[PDB]
Each structure stands twice: as C-alpha cells, then as structure tokens.
Amino acid sequence: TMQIKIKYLDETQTRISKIEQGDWIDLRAAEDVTIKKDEFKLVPLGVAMELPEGYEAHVVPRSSTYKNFGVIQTNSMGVIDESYKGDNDFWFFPAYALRDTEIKKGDRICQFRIMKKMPAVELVEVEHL
Amino acid sequence: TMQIKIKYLDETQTRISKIEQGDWIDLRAAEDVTIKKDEFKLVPLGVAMELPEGYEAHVVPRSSTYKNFGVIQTNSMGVIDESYKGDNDFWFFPAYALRDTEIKKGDRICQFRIMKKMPAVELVEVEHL
Amino acid sequence: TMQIKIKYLDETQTRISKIEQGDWIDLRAAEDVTIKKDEFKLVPLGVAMELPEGYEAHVVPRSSTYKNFGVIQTNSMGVIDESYKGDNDFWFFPAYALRDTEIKKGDRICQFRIMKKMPAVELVEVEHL
C-alpha cells in the first residue's frame, strides 16, 4: 500500500492512523473555534502530510457537518498538492457560518481522499475550434 | 458493461434513461419541496443504488441549480460509498435556499458520476516533514 | 502528452499556455464583474477548449478566492464535458456574492483539471436491494 507521512501540530491532536480500505478519512479541529453568523474562519486541522508522489488530496465537509455546525466550505473542495509537504504545511477547513456556531477541539469537521493528479497536457491555441 | 442496480422509491419516479456512456447523470427531486430563504431541507432524490465494488459516487449541483432552483448544496459534494446499498438507502440533495423556492417533483437539481475509491494508504506519523 | 486546443474570446485575454506537470490550472475573469451582496453572476473566463476525448474538466475556486472576492461557487465543482467544445462554448464561473465585490478583468478566480470520464455503466432497475 501507499505511504502518507503525517505530522501532528502537537501531542493533543487525535492520531488518525488505522487500516484503510479506500474510504475517505475524517479530519478534526485542532482547537475550539467560535464563528458568528456570516463570518468566516479557517478551522485548523492539526495535521501536515507528505502525500504520495504524483497525487493530490481533496477535502470536503462531512455529510452531517451542516446540521451539526451550520457551516459551509467556502472553497467548495480544497485541493492539497503533493508539494504541500513541509514541516509547517498544516491543513485547514475554510468555514463560513450561516448561524452562530462553535466547533470543539477534536470534532470531525471534514473528510479527504487522495487522487492521482491529472496527466501532462499541452494547451495549444487555435483561432477556431 | 459495469452495472449499477437501482431501486426507485416508487412507481411515480421518472426513471433514469439509457445513458450516454461516461456523462454525469442528472437526478430528480422525488417530490415537491418548499424551502424558505435561509432554510435547509433534505431534498429526496427517490433512488437507491448498489454501486460497483470499489467505486463511490459524487453528487454536485448543475451550473444552473442556483438560477433554476434557488439553492446551494450544504455538503459541497455528496460522496456515496459502495456500502450505501441497502434497500432503504435513498439518496438526497442537502439544499440551503438563498431565496424562497418551490422545487418540483422531477426537477433535475443535481448530477452524479461514479469514481474508483482511493487506493489503500497507510498513514505513518513522523516528528518532522 | 495530451493536447487541449484552446480558443480565447479575444486578443486581450491572458494566454495560459505553459509547461504542465499535473497541477491544476488557473482561469481568469474575461472582463470586470461587479456583484452585489446576495446576487449571482456567471463570471466569463474568456476561454473555450476542446478537451481530450474521453475526458472532462473540473472547476473549483482558488484557495484565496473567498478572502479576496467574497464569492462562493454555486455548483461546488463545475463539470465541463468533452462535448462542450464549440467555437462559442466559453467557460464561466458561477459566482454568488456574500458581500459586495468587484472582480477585475484578468484576475485569477478559479482553477481546473481534467479527469477521465466514468466508464460505461448499465443501470438495472431492481424491485429490492
């Protein structure tokens, strides 16, 4: 199987290694985050990762995230590149609150999977298609 | 040649037609739903599916879902796993209404495709990246 | 390497051809767009493409789009099929503004990659799963 190296922000972050069979993986808030209605905050997720060469990760909310927390993800789907593999390259979930809300440290807030990056392409300009 | 088994909620749901291979497939509201501006409702899609093994489905709006139906999708992209294949595992579109709206039975509110699940990965903690 | 043919709206659009290595590609507003709070506009991107056969494109916001512009993409992830390849099939970004905003001509507003279309599938209706 493919290795992903993961570094946690600190010792209190919930470790997320288990036997994986192709399911998306839940990520968790690194700290309590309060968000007022119609405000935006980056929810830190407390993990940095070196993804497999030639891969990227996609991040979206969980199914019940809206019900529980009343937030939407402002970028729709977050794309994490194999190059965001630095020692300070921590992941976040960009949240817009549709109601006053609180997200607690340790809460599952979004989920990711990996995906092979697109193949090499060359764009060629033409005057007409 | 890959098969998806599909169960409809009832006889009144408009069946999905012979497909054009590879194109996303539109899904229809299973009943009339009224949603007031700033309200959230699960819009039933009136279908349950057994996806091929090792696949998942992704569900997103149409480009015109906002113009036609007044809603955004609260989970950004719905991910339907192979394991959501039970006889009562019906699909929904989680709608937040940005204006008052009357969605109708049969309205093509979103679209789906299948995709292979990500490979088996092993997360390994490291102190530093 | 696969080719994508690209046609620009006019001579003033910024050409986006360069060496590609699987990264998503930024697309840019074709003209100034003003969007008031709680309004929606299709932001023109000034490009039409013939994608490789058997492939589709996916379009999402850039990571900083919400901070810089206050817009969310109403369809979450836009899907451009291979058949959207006509001389007047210009791409757009469906934007809903959460605050009064201005996007300037040439601003990077979203990004795309390609992905192979789903395989041929046969839907088989069953009475029970």
Ligand SMILES: O=c1ccn([C@H]2C[C@H](O)[C@@H](COP(=O)(O)NP(=O)(O)OP(=O)(O)O)O2)c(=O)[nH]1
């Ligand atoms: O939802 C997200 C999106 C991105 N990220 C990470 C990956 C991304 O590289 C980083 C932000 O760095 P940049 O501001 O450089 N954005 P990006 O890497 O997309 O830059 P570019 O526009 O050059 O591709 O945040 C998240 O943690 N969550």
Ligand SMILES: O=c1ccn([C@H]2C[C@H](O)[C@@H](COP(=O)(O)NP(=O)(O)OP(=O)(O)O)O2)c(=O)[nH]1
């Ligand atoms: O937009 C969606 C998303 C999910 N679904 C389906 C699939 C999902 O399995 C189901 C909701 O079941 P759960 O509350 O068990 N959520 P999920 O399967 O995502 O759970 P987990 O967090 O364990 O992966 O609704 C939709 O119909 N539309």
Ligand SMILES: O=c1ccn([C@H]2C[C@H](O)[C@@H](COP(=O)(O)NP(=O)(O)OP(=O)(O)O)O2)c(=O)[nH]1
């Ligand atoms: O974000 C997007 C989405 C689609 N598009 C273009 C390409 C796509 O083929 C076309 C239609 O997309 P949708 O299928 O999401 N909308 P709809 O079902 O309303 O259009 P059609 O009736 O043409 O399928 O719009 C964009 O330019 N940006």
Ligand SMILES: [Ca+2]
């Ligand atoms: Ca999950």
Ligand SMILES: [Ca+2]
């Ligand atoms: Ca409002």
Ligand SMILES: [Ca+2]
């Ligand atoms: Ca369509």
Ligand SMILES: [Ca+2]
């Ligand atoms: Ca990018």
